[PDB]
Amino acid sequence: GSKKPVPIIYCNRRTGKCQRM
Amino acid sequence: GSKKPVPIIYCNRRTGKCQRM
């Protein structure tokens, strides 16, 4: 319940990946 | 100057702040 309610992510173009916080 | 083209940010609710990558 830390990233579910809050759509906080970070896509690192360097590695072409994205995840939630 | 890489986050300009790519709208990659990260708002840390913990500190209630958001910035670009």
**Residue among A8, A12, A21 whose CB faces B21 most closely:** A12
Per DSSP, the three-state class of A19 is: strand
Q: How many CA atoms lie within 13 A of A15 on its CB side?
A: 6
DSSP state letter for A6: S
Cβ–Cβ of B11/A9 closer than 8 Å? no
Q: Which positions in chain A touch B13 (Cβ < 8 Å)?
A: 6, 8
Torsion (CA) A4, A6, B11, A10 in degrees, nearest 10: 30
Per DSSP, the three-state class of A18 is: strand
Contacts of A13 (CB under 8 A, 6+ apart): B2, B6, B8, B21
Residue B15 forms contact with A (CB below 8 Å): no
